[PDB]
Amino acid sequence: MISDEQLNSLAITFGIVMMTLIVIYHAVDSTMSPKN
What we know:
This protein has two helices and no strands. With 36 residues, the chain is mainly α.
């Protein structure tokens, strides 16, 4: 993250991959949340 760029197409790409590691980091670091 340097200048004006369209590279905010990472904050989707990366960010479904960060949303799976955060919600995973909540099962490891914090208390276990199961869905099913």
